[model samples]
Target chain A: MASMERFLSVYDEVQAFLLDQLQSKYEIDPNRARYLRIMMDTTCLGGKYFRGMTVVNVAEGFLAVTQHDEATKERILHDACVGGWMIEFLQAHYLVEDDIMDGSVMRRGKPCWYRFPGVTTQCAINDGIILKSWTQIMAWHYFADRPFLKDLLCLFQKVDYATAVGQMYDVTSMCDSNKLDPEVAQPMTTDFAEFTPAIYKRIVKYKTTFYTYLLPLVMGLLVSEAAASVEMNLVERVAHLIGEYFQVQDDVMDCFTPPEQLGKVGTDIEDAKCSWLAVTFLGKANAAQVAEFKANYGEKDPAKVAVVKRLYSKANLQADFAAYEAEVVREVESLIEQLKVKSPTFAESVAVVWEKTHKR
Target chain B: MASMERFLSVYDEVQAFLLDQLQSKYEIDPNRARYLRIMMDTTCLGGKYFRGMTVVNVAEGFLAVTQHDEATKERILHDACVGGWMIEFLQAHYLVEDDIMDGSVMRRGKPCWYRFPGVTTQCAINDGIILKSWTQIMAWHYFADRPFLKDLLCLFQKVDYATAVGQMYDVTSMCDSNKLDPEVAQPMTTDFAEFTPAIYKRIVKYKTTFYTYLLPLVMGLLVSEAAASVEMNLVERVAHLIGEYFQVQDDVMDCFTPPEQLGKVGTDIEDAKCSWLAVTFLGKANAAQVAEFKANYGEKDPAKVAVVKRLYSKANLQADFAAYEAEVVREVESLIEQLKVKSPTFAESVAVVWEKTHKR
Candidate 1:
C-alpha cells in the first residue's frame, strides 16, 4: 500500500506534466485539446503501471543504497519520475497501436482508445505517433543537459526499434499462418509440428520482454547513473527469462481467466495466435489429438472454443504449465541470487518485479 | 538530367543501406523483410528526390566553400548522404500515414503505399514508425560521437514535433468544421471570417515548410559543421516564404493542373482541406456564392469538384495566384540577395531549391 501510494503520486505528477505539455508547448486548440486530453486520460492513465513502478522504485532503491545527499536524492527522484512517466507513455503508445493491430476491442476494462466515439483508426494511428514522440520530448526537456542524456535517448530508441522488429516478427508469423497457401504458412509442423521454442522465445523477447522488463530497469539504472556499476548482460538474461514467463502466463490466462478479470473475452484461439499452449500442446499431442486441435483451433465459434479447451484438459496442459512456472521461478531465483552478491540493490529491485509477476 | 543521375545513385545507395540494416542489424525474417522492402521501394523511391537532393547539394556546396581535404570531404559527404536519405525516409513515413488520413488513392503515379495489396492500415502505421526510426538510427550509427550529434538528434525531433503539431492544427481545422454541432464546425462567415492568413502560415510552416524546405537545408548545414556560421533566421525566413508559395502553387495546381501532369487527381476539395483557395473563397464569396460553395464543396462527385473550380475561375484566383507567385519570388529573391552577400554558398543552394520548386 505504501509503494502503491508512492506510485500513484508519481503517476499523478506525470499526468500533470503531460497536460502542461499540451497547454504550454502544444497550445492546442480547445476542441483538439479535448480530444487529446481524452486520449491521454483514457489510454495513459490506468493500469497497475508495473513498468512505471519498477522505474521509480528501482531508482529510489538505487539512490538509497548509494546514500546520496537528501537534496540530490530529491532532484534525481523527481527526474526519475519523468523517466517513469516516459515508460508509461511508451506503453500507452504501444497499446493504442497494438490494440488496433490485434483488433482488440477492450483494454484495461474499457473499450480500446481506438474504439472511442468519433475516433477512427486514423486518429488512433496519429495518437500513437503523438504519444511516442512525447516519450522523447519529455526526456529531452527534463534531461537534455545531463551527462547521460545521449545514453537515455539511445536506450529509448534502441528499445523502440527492437520492439518494432519484434512486432514485425509477430505480425509476420500471424500473416504467414493466415496466408493463402497453407503449406508455406504452416510449414513448421514438420517434426513435432509448426511450433518451436526458439520462435516463441524470439517473439516474447522482442515484443514483450524488452519493453516490459528490460526498458524500465535499464531506464532506472540509466537515470540513477548506476549503469556503469550494473551488469547489463545478467540483467538482460534474467529479465528475458522473466519476460518469457510473463508472456506465457499471459497467454495461459487469456483462455483461462474469467472475462470479467481479463477485461475482454479471450480471442487468441480465434486469432490463431502462436500462443504458449498452442506451441506446447503441439509438441505433446498425438496424431488424433493433433488433428482434433488443428480443425477446432482458430475458430470463433463457442463450440470450437469449448472443444479446444477440453483438449487442453485431456492433454493435462494445466499440470504442464504448473511445472513450467516452477522451473522458471527457480531459474530466475538462481540468477537473482548470483546478482545479489555483486549488487544487492539491483537484485532486490528485480526480486520486487519477480514477486509482482507471480502475485498478479 | 545530371542532377537526376546524382540523386538516383545516392537514392540507390540509401536503399541498399536500408536493406543491409534489416539483414545485419535486425536479422528480420525473410517474409517480413519482403514487405518492408516493398514498402521502402514503393514509397521512398521514384519521387524527384527534392528534399533529399537539397540535403546532399547543400552539404556539398558547404564543404566546397569550407575547403576540406579530399578524404574528409568524402567522409562528410558520405554521412551527408545518410542525412539526405534520412529526409527521404522521413518523407516516406509521413506520406504513408498522411494518405490514410486524407484517403488519398494515388501517389507519384501509383497507388499509395497504404493501398498496396496485402497491406492493412496497421502495416502502414508500423512501417511509418519503422522508417522514421531508421532516420535516426542511421544518424546515430554514423555520427554518434560527433560534437553536433545531439543537435542532429534534436533537429530531427524538433522538425518531426513541429510537423505533428502542424498536423494537429490542420486536422483540428478540418474536424472542427465537420463535428456533430453544425454551427461549431462551420462558423466561417463572420467579419474576418474563416480565412485568417495567420492560420494559413501556421499550417504551411508546420506541415510543409519545416520538413520540406528548412529541414533539408539545416540538416545539411549542421552535418557540414557550418551550423555556427550560417544565419538560420534568414534561411528559415526565406525558406518558409518559398514553402508557402510552393504550397499555394500546389493548391493552385490542384485546381488548375491536368490530372496527368499532377500524377494524381487532387482531392483537396472533396477532403475539405484547409486549402488557400477554400479559405480565400470563403472571404470573397457573397451569400448565394457561399451557399453554392458549401453545397458542392467537400464531396467526391466530379461535378461538385467542377462547381468549385468554376467558382475559382469566376473569382480570378488563377490571375491572383500569378501575381501572388511573382510577389513571393521577388521577396525570396531579395532575401537570397542579402544571403548572397554574407554566404554565397547558402544563397546558391537555396536558389537551386527555388528553381526546382517553380519548375516542378
Candidate 2:
C-alpha cells in the first residue's frame, strides 16, 4: 500500500515537472502555463490509477530490480513511477478526446475538460491534442537512457493507433447518421443492426484491452529489463481475457451504476454506444421486444430512455451480467493460476490488478 | 523536376499502403476504411508539397547521397520521398484540426473535411487525431531500419509539442472567453491588449517556422545521417528569419488574397487571430487610428471588414510588408552565404528549399 501511495504520488511530481519545464525550459506564457497545469489536473490526475501502478508493482517486484542496491532500487522505482505516469498521460489524452466525442459532461466528479468553465470545444480539443503529444515527449524526457526507450515509444504509438482504430469502429458501430451533433448531451439514433457480439468484442479488445490491460504489464516488463525472456503470447492471452471481462462489466455498470459511483453519467443508451447490453438484447429479443428496443434504444426523450430501461429489466440483463461477472472471474482466475506456474511475479502483478477491478 | 514529381507521387502510394494495411492487417470495418482513405485524400493529398519535396531535394542533392551507386541512389531517393511525405502527413493533420478550430468552410478548393457531407466535428477530429499519430507510425513503418528512426521519432514528437505550444499561445491569444462555439464561423471578440509584436514572432517561430522551414530540412539531414555533423543553431537562425517573413506576408495575403487563390478563406481577422498586421498597426497607430483598429479589426460584417481594409490601406501595410519581406530575403540569403563556407552541401540543400518557399 505504501508503494502504491508512492506510485500515485508520482502524478503530482509529473505535473510539477511539466509545469516547471513549461515556464523555464519552454518559456511558455504564465497564463497559458496555468491552463496546462489545469488541463493535467482535471483530466490526468483522477482515475482508479491501477493502470499506472501495475507497471510499478510488476517492475519493483522483478528479480532484476529487486536484486539492485537500495539506492539503485529507489532510483529505478522512481523511474518506473515516471513510466507509469506516462501511461496516465496517455489515458488522460484519450479520455479528454473521448469525452469530447461522447458528449460527456462530468468526468471524475468534475466537468469534463472540454466542459469545464472557460474551456469550450476548440480549447478542449487542443488541450487533448497536447496531452496526446506527451506520449513521446515524456518518453524522451524520462527514459532516454534506458535500452527500452525506443521500444517504449513504439509501444505507446502502437497502442494509441489501436485504440483510435477501435474508437473509429465504436463510433461507426453506433452512428446511424454522420450528422449528429457531438455537443448535444442526448440519445443518438441507432440502427440495431450493427449491434453484434463479434463487433462488440473487437471493439473491446482494441479500445479497452490494449490500453488498460496489456500496456501497463508490458511497460513493467520492459522497464524491468525482463521482457526479453518472457513469452509475450502468454502475457497477451491473459490481457485479452481480462480486457474482455472488464469492458463487459463496464457496459453493465453504465446501465446500473449511479454517476456518483461511476464518476460520470452513463450515456451508453443515450450516446448509442456499442455495448454488450445492446448486443445481448438484439440476440435474444422477440419481434415486439426488438421493436421496443429499436424505438427506445437511442432516443433523446426521457420517456423513451425509460422505455429502454424497462425493456432492459424485462430482458433481465442485470442477472445476465451477474452471470457474466462470475464466469469471467472464474475463467480469468484459472488463467492467472496457470500463469503463476510460469512466473509468479508476473502473475501476481496481474492478479493484483484483477482484484482491484472487481473491488472497484 | 522529375524527382519532385516522384516525391508528390508518394502521396498516392502512402494512401494505398495505409488503406491496404487497415483492411488486411488491422481488419478495420469496410466503411471505416473508406473514411480513412477519404480523410487522407482530402487533407493529405492536395498540399503544394513543397515542404515534403524539400526533404527529397536536399537528400538527393547531398554529396553523400549523390555519390552512391545508381541502385543505391534510387533506393535512397524513394526512402527520402517517404520521409518527405510524412511532412505532408503532419501538415494535413494540423490543417484538419486547424480547419475545425478555425471554422473554415473550404480548403484547397474543396469543402473542409468537417464541412463535407456526412462528416461533422467529431469524426473530423478523430480522423485528424489519426493523422497526427502517423508521425511515428510512419517513422516506424518506413525508416525503422535506418539509424535515424529514433532520432526521427523524437524529432516528430519535439516538433509536434512545439507546434502545439504555439497553437496554445495561438489559441489563448485569440480567445476572449472560454466558451466560443467552435462550430460557428464568425468574427471572434478579442482583448487586443494580448496581441504584441513579441508574441507574434514567438507564435510564428513555433507555429510555422519549426515545421515548415526547420523540420523538413532536419528530416533530410537526419535521413542522410548528416545531422550529427551540422550546426542546427545556424539552420534555426535562417528558419526564424524566413518564418517571420512568410507569416507577415501571410497575414497581409489573408486580407487581400481571393479564396480561389488562397485555397481556404483566411479567418485571421474574423478569428481574432494574433497576426503581424494587427501587432504592427497597434504599435504605430495614433489614438483615433488605434480606436478605428479596435472597432473594425475583427468584425465579421462585410461593411466593417471593408472598414478594416480601408484602414489597412491608410496604414500602408502592403508597402510595409514588402519592405519587411525584402529585408528578410536579404538577411536570410546573407546567412546562407556564410553557411556555405562551412558546408556548401548543407547551405545548398537549404537554398533549394528557400527558393521553392519564395516562389510559392
Candidate 3:
C-alpha cells in the first residue's frame, strides 16, 4: 500500500506538469485544450497502476541502496515519477486504442475515451497518439539531460512493437473483418485452430509481458541509474516468466472473478479471445468437447457464455489455474532468488515488482 | 528528379532491412508478418519521397561542406537513409491513422491500408501502432550507439506531439460525434463557426509543418552531425513558414489541380477541412457568401462540392494562391539567404530541400 502510495503520490504533480504543458507549450485553441486533459484524465486515472508503481518502488529501492543525499533523493524521486508517469501514459495509449480495436464499450468504469459524449474514434485515435507522444514529451522534459534517456526511449520502442505484434495475433486470431468498411467486407470467422499453446504463449509474451512487466522494471533501473550494474539476461528471463504468469491471472480472473473484484466486465469467452483458460480446456478435452467449446465460445449470448463457463469447470480450470498459479509462483520466486546471488541489492530492488506481480 | 532518385535508391535496402527485422528477430507466426511488410509497402511507397529525400539531400550537402572520405561518406550515407527512411515511416504513421480518422477511401492511388481486402479498422489500428514503432525501432538500430541517438529520439518526440496537436484541431473541427457509439449517439454537426484563419494556421502548422517540412530538415542536420552548427531558431521559423506555405499549395492544388497531377482525390471542401483557400474565401466574402459557403462546403454531393469550388474562383483563390505562392517563395529564399550569412555551408546544405518544397 505504501509502495502504491509513493507511486500514486507523484501523479498530481506529474499531471500538473502535463496540464501546464497543454497550457504553455501547445498554445492550442481553448476548447480543444480541455479535450487533451480529458483524454489524460479519463484514461490515465482510475487504474490499478501496478505497472507504474513498480517503477517508483524499484527506483526507490535502488536509490536506498545507492544512498543518495536527502535533497538529491527527493529531486531524483520527482524525476523518477516522470518515468513512472509515462509508463502509465504508454499503457493509456494502448488501452485507449485497444478499446477502439476491440469495440469495447466501457473502460475503467466509464465510457471509453473514444466513446465520450462529444468524442468519436477519430478524436480518440488522435488522443491515443497524443498519449504516446506524452510518453515521449514527459521523458524529454524530465530525462533530456539524463544519461539513460536513450535507453528509456528504446525500451518504449521495444515494448510498443512487442505489444503491437501481440495485438495482431489477438485481433486477427478473432473474427475481425470489414465490419467498419462494408464496401469490400467479407464474412468474419475466428481462427480457432491458431489457439494452440505455442501460439497462446507467443501472444501472451508478446502482448502483455514486455510492456506490462519488463518495461516498468527496466524504466526504474534506467531512471535510478542502476541499469549498468544489473545483469540483464536474468532480469529479462525473470520478467518474461513473471509477465506470462501475471496474464494467466488476468485470463483466469476475467472468467472466474466477479465484476466487483475484477473491476470491469469480462469478455474473453464472448470475444473468443486467445485466452489461457480456454486453451487449457481445449487441450484437456476430446474432439467432442472441442466441438462443444467452439459452439459455446465467441457468442454474445449470456446463455452461451454460461455454457462455456460450465465447460471450464468440467475441464477443472479452477484446479488447473490454482495449480498453475502456484507452479509459476514457485518457479518465479526461485528465479528471482538466483538474482540475489549476483547482487542482493539488485534482487532487493526488483522484489517489490515480484510482489506486485502476484498480489496477495 | 536526381535529388528524388538519391532518396528513392535507399528505400529497397532500408525496407529489406525492416523486413529482415521482422523475420529474424520476432520469431512469431508466419502469415501475419506479410501483413506488416504489406502495410509498409502500401503506405510508405506510392507517395512523393519529397520529405524523405529532403533528409538525404540536406545531409549530403552538410557532409560535402564538412567533407569526408568517399568510403566514410558511403557508410554514413547508408546510415543516413535510416534517418530519412524513418522520417517517411513517421509520415506513413500519420497518414495511416489519419485515413482511418477521415474515413478516406483511397490513398496513394490504392485502397487505404485499413480498407484492404481482408484488413479492418482493428488490424489497421494496430498496424498504425506498428508503423510508429517502426520509426523508433529503425532509429534504435541505426543510431543506438551514436552520440546523436538521444537527439534523434527527442526530435521524433517533438514532431509527434506537434503533429498530434495539429490533428486534434483538424479532427475536432469536423462534426465527429458518436456515429460509432450508437448507444449514446448525438446529432452530427460541423462547427463551421470555429473555422478561422488563426485556427487554420494552428491546424496546418501543427499538423503538416512540423513533421512534413521541419522534421526531415532537422533529421538531416542530426544525421550529418551538423545540428550543433546550425541556427535552429531560424530553421524553426523557416520550417513553420515553409510548412504553412506548403499546405496552402496543398489547399490550392486540391481544388485547382487535375487528379492526374495531384495523384489522389481531393476532399478538402467536402470534408470541411481547415484549408487556406476556404478560410481566405470566408475572409473575403460577404455575410451571404459565408452563408452560401457553409451550405456548399462539407457535403457529399457533387453539386455541393462544385458550389464550394465556384466560390473559391469568385473569391479569386487562384489569383490569391498564386500571389501567395510567389510571395512565400521570395520570403523563404531570403530566409535561406539569412542562413547563408550565419553559415554559408549550412545554407548550402538545406538548399535542395528549399527546391523540393517549391518544385517547378
Candidate 4:
C-alpha cells in the first residue's frame, strides 16, 4: 500500500491533468484573456486543499467496504478528486464576475484577475458566465454515468441560486450607506455592531459553506458504502456550522494577523468590508471613539492608520477573538453530543473540523 | 375567425402573461422594482408586430395541410406568438445589459433604465440576467409536452450564442479607432457599394435572417403537417437575407432618419454602436473631416451636433441609402425567380417580408 506521501503525489498529478484540459481548449483572445489565466491559476493554487481532498478521501473510505483491489480504489479516488476540482472551477467563475461587480482590487494576495491589463471589464463579466456554463458542460461530460449526477446537479443549482441571492442582497444592502445622516452615524455604529456578526455568518453560509464544505464533503459521503444510511442533512448542518466558524476566524485574522504569515494585510477598513471584526470594533467604540475611527480608518493617512490600530488595540479585539474561538468550539461540542456517534469515523470527522477551524 | 383588429388584444394578453411569470417567484426591492418594470414595458411595446403576425399568419397557412379545427389553430397561433415575444425579450436582455456596459443614457426615447433614479447600476445588470434565465424556464415549461422541445431549445441556444459572439466582437473591435480611418474603412464600404442594390436585399438575410426570421418561421413549419417539405435551411437563408437588411435599415433610421418619426433619437455614437452607416461614414470622410468628427460626434454640444449633421449630409448618405434600397429589391426578385412556388400560400409568405421591409 502507498503511504500518505505517495498519495499527495496524486494531487499534483490531478492538478497537471486539469490545467492541461482547461488550457488546451480554452480560447483566450478578443476577450478577457489575462484575467482568465490568473483565475485558472488561482483556482488551482489558493487556500487549503481540503475540499477536493475530501472528495478523494471519502472515495477511499468507501473503498474499504468493497472487496475491490488497489487499482479500483485508486481509480475511484482519481475520479472523485477531478470532479471536486470541477466544483472549484465553478467557484472561480463566480469570483471572477463578483470581483468586477464589487470593484475589488485584490484577492488571494494578487490583483483581482479581471483588473489585469488586456482584461477589459466587459469581457470578464461574460467569462464568468461562460464559467458557469462550462461547469454544466463538464457535468454532461464527466459525471454522465454516475447514478447521483442528477441529484448532485440539483444541489448545485440550488447552491448557485443561493449564492446569487446572497450577492444581490450584499450589493443592494451595502449600497444603502450613501443616504445615512451624519447624526445617525453613532447609532449606525451600534446597530452595525449588533447586526454585523449575524450578517457575516449568513454571508459565509450562503457564499462559501455549500460549495466549499457541504457539497464536496457530502459528495464524498454519498459515494461511500454506507451512503444510503449516512443521513445527509445531519451531515450538512454540522459541516455548515464548522464552516461558519472557519470563516469567522478568517475575518478575525484579516484584522489582527501579521502579513508575512497570512500572505497580505487586510483591507477590512479600507474597503469597509462587512466583516465581523469591523462590527466588533464599531460596537465597542463610544461616540468619541467612533468619530476617531471615521476620521482615520480609511483616510489614507499614516497617522490615521496608527490611530485606528491603537483604537483596535484598546478595544481588546485580540481577547474578543479568543472568546469567539471558545464560543465556536462550544457550538461544535454541542453538535458532537447530538450526533452521539458510536462510529469512530464520525468522531474523527468531528476532530478534523476542530483541528482545521482553529489551525493557528 | 378573429380578424387582425384583435391582434393588439392578443399582444397585450401575452405581454401581461410574460411579465407576471417573470415576477411571480422573484422579488426586487422598490428601487429596482420601478426601473425594471418600466424598462420591460417599453421594450415589449416597441416590437413591429411582425413576428407575432407571422405566428398568426402561419397558423392560418398551415390549415391548408392539417385537417385540425380552428380551435386547435388558435392554440397554435398563441404558442407561436408567445415564442416570438420570447425573441423580443431576449433582444431586450442584451440591450439593457449593453446599455450599462457602454454607459448609454438614452434608448427608445427615454433615459436608459439603469440611469433612472432609485436604481443602482448593478440592479440593472442583474435584472437583465434574471430575465434571460426566466426566458429559458418559461420555454421549458411551455414546451414540456411538445416532442420538439429539445430541438427548439437547440435553436434558441444557437441564437443566444450568435448574439453573444456578435456583441463580443463589437465591443472588442471598437477599442482601436484606426480601423475607422478612411483609408482603412474604404475597402469595406467599396465592397458594399459595389454590390449596391443586391446587398440591400441580402442585408437582413445575413444579420437577423436566421435568428429573428428563419428560426421562428421554420419552427412553426416543424410542428405543422407540411413539415416534410419545409426546406428548413433554404427558408432560413431567405429569412436571413431579410433580417439582415431589416437591422441595417434600423441602423440607418437611428442615425440619419428624423427622430420624431423614428420615436426616438439614437446613441450610435456614445454607445460605440457598430452600425454600417458609421462604417460607411468613415469611408467617405477625409482626414480633416475625420478630425472634425472625432471632436464633435459624441459631444453633447448642439453646435457640434449641427456641424456633424452637415458633414453626414455632405457625404450624400441619402443617395447611398437609395442605392442600397434599390439593390435589395433587385436581389429579392432574382431569388424569387429561382424558387417559383407551386403553393398559393408561398407567395403570401414572400409578400410579408416585402411589405415589412418597404413599409417606410
Candidate 5:
C-alpha cells in the first residue's frame, strides 16, 4: 500500500507530463490527450511498485546504517525512487509495443495503446519508442555527471539487450510460421526439461526479473556505489527465481482470477503465449487432456473455453504452477533472510520487494 | 544516376551492417538471417544519400587541403559517410511511425514497414526504434574515446532535437482535429506558412542537412584541426542554404515525379504534410483558388486531382521551387568562387556537392 501511495502520488505529475508532452509539445488534441492518459494509466494499473519501493527502501536503509547527512540521504532516496519510476516507464514502453505485437486489446484495464482511438497500428509503435527514449533522457538528466553515469547508461543497455533477446525468442515461440516450425515446437515430452517447459522460466527471468525487481535493487546498489562484485551473482540467481515465479503467477492469474479483477478475458491462451503452464501441460499432460487443451485453449468459443479449463484441471497444470510459485515464494523468503546476515541494509529492502510481490 | 549509384553503394554497406546486427550472436540460423536481411532492406528505402556523399566529399576536401595521411582521411570519410547514413536511419525511424499514423501504405515502391506482410504494428515500431538506436550506437562506437567526442554527441543531439520538434508539429498538425476547425483553419493559413508547412524543411535541414553535410565537413575541419573564424560561419551558412534548397527540390519532386520514377503517389497530400507547396499555396492562394485547392487537392477523384494540378500549374509552384533551387545553386557557386580565392581545393569539393544536387 505504501508502494501504491508512492506511485499514485506521481499519477498527477505523470499525467501532466504526458499531457504536456503530447499537447504543448506534441500538439495532440485535448480529446487525444484523454485517450493517451487512459492508456498510460492502464499500463500502470496494479503495479506493485516493488521495484520502485525497493529503490526508496534501499536509500532509507543506507541512510540509517551509514548515518549520512539528511541532504545526502535525500539525494540517494530520490535517485532510487526516481530510478524505480523510470523502470516503470521502460515497462510501459515495452508493453505498449508488446501489446501490439500480441494483437492484444485490454491491458491493465483499458485498450492497449495501439488499440486506442485514432492510434494507427504504426503510430502506436512510435509511442513505445518515445517512452523508452524519454526514460533514458530522464535518467541522463537526473543522474548527469554523477560518478555512476557510465554504469547507469550501461545498465540501460544491459536491460534493453536482455529484454530484446527475450522478446525475440518469445515472438519466435509464438505462431511465426517462418521461425516456429513443428520441429521447434515438438520436443516437449523430451526428458530435457531445461530445453522444454523450463525455457519459459528462463525467458521471463531474463526479460522481466532483471527489468522489474533485479534492476531496481541493482540500481539501488549502484546509488549506494556498492562494489560491482558484492551482490551481482547471488542477486542474479535469486532475482531470476523470483522473476520466474512472478511471471508464472501472472500467467495463472490471467486465467483464474475473477473476471472483474482480471479485467479482460484471458487472451494469453488466444495468443498462444508460451507460458509456464502451457509448457508444463505439454510435458506432463495425459494424451486425452493434452489433445483437449491444444484444441480449445486458443479457440474463441465459450464452450471451448470450458473444455480448456477442464483440461487444465484434469492435467493439474494449475496445481503444478501453484506448487512452483509456493516453492519460489518460500525460497525468496529464505534468501532474504540469508542476505540480511550478509548485508542487513540491502537485505531489508530486498525483502520488502518479496513481500510486495506475494501481496500483489 | 551516378549520384544515386554512389548513394546506393553506401546503402549496401549499411544493409550489410544492419543484417549482421540481427543475427543470433549465440548461434547462427540461416533462415533467421534471411528474414533479418529482408527486414533491413524493406525499411531502409527512400531519400538519396546526398548527405552521406557530402560527408565523404567534404572530408576528402579537408584531406586535400590539410595533407593528412590517407588512413586518417579514410577513417574520417567513413565516419562522415556513416553519419550521413544515420540521418536516413533517423528519418526512416520517423517515417515508419508516420506511415502508421497516417495509414500510408506504399513508400519508395515498398510497403511501409508496418504494412509489410510479416510485420505487426508493434514490430514495425521496434524496427524503427532499432534503426534510431543503431544510429546513435554507431556514432558512439565510431567516436569512442576519440577527441571531439563531445562535439560528435552534440551533433547527434542537434539532429534528434530538430527531428523530434518537426515530428511533434507534423504529427499534431495532421492528427489534431482543432487544426481542421474551419475558424482555426482560416487563421492557420498564415500559421501554416512559416511554421507548419516549413516544418518538413526545417526538420530536413537541422535533422538531415546539418548532420549530413555541415557536421561532416565541420568534423573534417575539426579532425584536420583547422583554425576557425568568421570564414567558417560563412561556409556553414552557405552549406545550410544549399542543403535547404536541395530538400525543397525533393518536396517538389515528391509531387511531380511520376510513380514509375518516384515510386508512389505523393504521400504529402494524404499526410496533410506541412510542405513548401502546401505553405505557399495557402499563403498565395486567391479566394477561389484556395477554395478549389481545399476541396480538390486532397480528393481522390481524377477531376479533382486534375483541378489541383491545374491550380498548382498556374500558381507555378514547380517553377517557384525551381527558381528557389537555381538561386541557391548560383549563390553556392559564387560562394565557392570566393573560397577559391582563399583555397581552391576546398572550393572544388564544395562545388561537387552543388553539382550533384541536380544530378538525379
Candidate 6:
C-alpha cells in the first residue's frame, strides 16, 4: 500500500501535468495563464481527494492479478493516475458552479472560488467550464486510442448530463420549496408535505453518486487489462448503495457536527435543501412536529436551528442513521463478496473505498 | 440550391430532435423542462442563421460533388443539418455566457437570456452549460460511429479552449484599460492608447474566426467522404483571414450603424472592448486627437459618444475601411480561385461564407 506521502506526491505530479497541458494546448498569455493556474490550484488541489485516490488504488489493485511486464504495468499506472485527475477535474467543475448556485461562501474551509478577491461569479462560471474543457482535452490526449476510448468519453458525457439534470432538479426544488408567496421571491424554506424520500434519492443518485463514486471506479476498471472480467452493472449498483450511505452521513454531519470540525458550516437547512435528514424527518414526524419543523427549517435564526435539532432529537434520528448505515454496509459487502468470486483485486479496491468513507 | 424555407424547416426539425432527446435522456419533469425549452428557444433559435446556415450550405455544397445514392445523400444531409444545429448550439452557449460577462442587455433584437423574467445570472450559467451538454450529447448521438467523430470532438474541444482563452484576455485587457483604483470595483471603460491593431487581430482570430467562420467550414469538410482530401491548415488560414475581416466590419458598423439596424445598441465603447476601431483610431490619431479620445471614450453620455464619432470621421476611418475591405476581398477571392482548382465544392462553400459577411 502506498503511504499518505506517496499519494500526495501523485497529486502534485498530476497537478503539474494539468498546468503544463493548460499552458501548451490553450496557449494562454502569461497574465491570464497565471489567473487560470491559481484557479486550478485553488479548486482542484485542496480537496480530500478520496475520488482521485479511488481511481489510482482501483487501477493498482486490478493490475496486481495481471501477468503484464513491469514496464507495461508502470505505464498503465501512470495513465490511471491521469484518469484519477480527470475525476478531480470534474469534481472541481461541479463544486465551483454548485457553490455559486447555492450562494456558498466557503468550501473546504476556504472562501469558495467564486468568492475569492478579483473573481466575480461570471468568471467562476467560465472557470467551471474551463475545468470541464480540461477533462475532455486530457481524456483525448491520454485515452483516445484505446479500445475503450468511446466508452470513456460517453461515460463522462452521460455523467455530466445526469449531473446537470440533477442540478436543475435541485434548483427548481428549492424554488418550489420557497414558494411562500406567488409574487415575491422568498428565501428557500421547505415544507414537509411536499416530497418523499424517493425525490431525495434521485437527487443523490444523479448529483453525487454518478460522479463521485461510480466514475472513479468505472475509470479505473476501464484502464485494467482485466476490465472485461468485471460487470459494470454490479459495480454501479454497489457504488450507488455506498453513495446513498455516504450522502446520508453527510446530511447527519451537517446538522450535528461543528463547523470547525466539518471544515465548513452546513447550510442545507438554511438553503431549504431536499436533504436526506429533511425527508426522513418528514416521514417520521407527527402533525405538530411537522408544523414546528416547517416554521423553523429554513430560517436563519439560531433558535430556529435549535428547534430543528430538538425535533431530530425527539425522533432519535441518530439511531435511524445507524440502522440505515449498517444495512447499506451489509448490502455493499455482500455484493462485493459476490464480485470477489470473479475479480478479487477489484473487490478489494472497492472494499478499500468502503473502509475509507465509513471509518470516519 | 435549397430555398430559405427548406433551410428553416431543417432548423425546426433539429429543434424537435433536441427537445425529444432532452425529455427522454434527462427525464426532467414538465415544469423544469419548460424552463429549459424556453432557454433553448430563446438563445439557440434567434440568431441570424449566418453561422448555422453556413454549416448546412457548406455540407450541402460539399456533398454536391459526391456520387452517393439518393437515400445515402438524404441520410448524410439529415446528419449534416444535425451538425449545423450543433454549431448553433455552441454559438448559443457562448453568446449566453458572453452576454452575461459583458453585461449586454440585448441579443438578436431582444433582451439577453440572462435578463429574462425570473432568470438570475446563476441560472444563465447553468443554461449555458446545458447548451454545451447538448452539444456533447448530440454529437455522440449523431456521429459516434462515423469515421470522423474524434476529429469533430477534438475540433470542438480546441475551438472552445481557444475561445475561452480569448475571453480571459478580453476580460483582463479591460481591467488593464480601466486601471481603476485597486480597492474599488468600477464599471467597464476603455482607452484608445492602451491597445494596437495586432492585439485586436489576435482577439478576432480566437474569439470570432475560430468558431464562427472556421468551425462551420471544418464541420462540413469532416462530414464529406473527402474529409481526408483537404488540408485543414489551409482551411483554417482562409477562415482566420475572413474572420478578422468580418470582425473589423462589425466594429465599423457598431459606430456607424443605428441600434434599429444592428438589433442591439453597440456597447463596445462602454464595455471597454479591445475592438478594431479602438486600435485603428489609436494607430492614426495625432496628440490632441488622442487626448480628446481618451477623455471621451468609454463614457455613457451622448456628448462623449459624439466626440468619439467625430474623431473617427476626422481620422477618415471610412475611407480606410473601404480600402481595407477591397484588399481583403481581393486576397480572399484569389485564394478561393486557387482552392477551386483542387476542390471546387469546398471552395464554393467557403465563398458563400465570404459573400454573406463581406457583402453585408
In terms of TM-score, the best-performing candidate is 2
Clashing pairs in 5: B197-B274
Per-residue CA lDDT of model 6 for A1-360, tens digit only, reads: 363455566567755666676567555555565677778888888667888778778878867777889887876777677777888889999999888777888877888887876777657777887888888777787777877678888888888888887777666555663342212343454455545777777777877888889988998887775567788778989988889888888888888889988878897777677777888888888899989988888778988888888888889887778788888878998989988877888888888889888996
Candidate 2 stretches greater than 4 Å from native: A63-66, A175-191, B63-66, B175-191
Clashing pairs in 2: A118-B178
At residue B203, candidate 5 shows an lDDT of 52
Expressed as tens digits, the lDDT of each residue in B149-252 for candidate 4 is 55565566555644553454455444442233211221112122222233223322323555567665666654453455445545655576667667778877
Cα lDDT, model 1, residue A159 = 85
lDDT of 4 at A219: 67
Candidate 4 local lDDT, residue A254: 76
Rank order by DockQ, top first? 3, 6, 2, 1, 5, 4
lDDT of 2 at B338: 77
| TM (chain A), candidate 1 | 0.92
Per-prediction DockQ scores?
0.33, 0.36, 0.40, 0.12, 0.22, 0.37
Q: Among the candidates, what TM-score does chain A have in each?
A: 0.92, 0.91, 0.90, 0.78, 0.82, 0.91
Candidate 5 error regions (>4 Å):
A1-50, A118-123, A176-195, A227-229, A330-342, B1-34, B41-48, B51-58, B64-88, B136-144, B147-158, B175-243, B326-355
For residue A300, what is the lDDT in candidate 6?
82
> Clashes in each model (backbone N, CA, C under 3 Å)?
4, 1, 0, 16, 1, 0
lDDT of 6 by residue, B290-355 (tens): 899888877789888888888888898877788888889898988787777678888888888888
Q: Against the hidden reference, what TM-scores do the models get? A: 0.92, 0.93, 0.91, 0.68, 0.80, 0.92
Model 2 per-residue lDDT tens digits across residues A165-204: 8777777667542433333232344456667788788888
* Model 4 spans with C-alpha error above 4 angstroms: A1-86, A137-154, A175-200, A214-232, A257-266, A270-273, A279-313, A317-360, B1-92, B136-158, B175-232, B235-240, B258-274, B278-360
Docking class of 4: incorrect
Mind giving the per-residue lDDT tens digits that candidate 3 earns over B220-244?
A: 7887888767689889888998888
- Which candidate leads the pack in DockQ? 3
Output DockQ, candidate 4: 0.12
Measured with C-alpha atoms, the lDDT of residue B7 in candidate 2 is 83
